[PDB]
Amino acid sequence: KSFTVEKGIYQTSNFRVQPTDSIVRFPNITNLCPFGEVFNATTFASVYAW
Amino acid sequence: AYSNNSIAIPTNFTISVTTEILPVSMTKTSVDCTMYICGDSTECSNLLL
Ligand SMILES: *[C@@H]1O[C@H](CO)[C@@H](O)[C@H](O)[C@H]1NC(C)=O
Ligand SMILES: *[C@@H]1O[C@H](CO)[C@@H](O)[C@H](O)[C@H]1NC(C)=O
Numbered sequence A: 001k002s003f004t005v006e007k008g009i010y011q012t013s014n015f016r017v018q019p020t021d022s023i024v025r026f027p028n029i030t031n032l033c034p035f036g037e038v039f040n041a042t043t044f045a046s047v048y049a050w
Numbered sequence B: 001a002y003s004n005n006s007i008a009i010p011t012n013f014t015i016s017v018t019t020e021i022l023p024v025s026m027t028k029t030s031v032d033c034t035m036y037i038c039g040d041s042t043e044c045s046n047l048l049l
């Protein structure tokens, strides 16, 4: 944290190899969850018998 | 056996060698400020700033 460095040997850190690629790996499931079927039911339940 | 006119004078001697151990130095260590706390995370490094 200075613009000038004295003579000696200094321990540095984080030599700035910053990543530039982002990858994603997900399973092979492709079918969509039946949210419409669940939400489209004629009757849901009673609260005491959920 | 103390007395006011009695003395004891040694006749022989022994040559003894003893040992003394004294620590002089310990291990020198260094710690990374960022990689210990927020290891490999730009968001956490920004917060640590
Ligand atoms: C419920 O399902 C029927 C037939 O599958 C469909 O005609 C109806 O539009 C659905 N209801 C809603 C709110 O999407
Ligand atoms: C001390 O020395 C005197 C002689 O000067 C002697 O009479 C006396 O007994 C000695 N003391 C003891 C405790 O022996």
Ligand SMILES: *[C@@H]1O[C@H](CO)[C@@H](O)[C@H](O)[C@H]1NC(C)=O
Pocket: B011, B012, B013
């Ligand atoms: C001193 O001790 C050594 C070892 O036991 C022995 O050989 C020697 O004779 C002794 N000297 C005297 C004067 O008693």
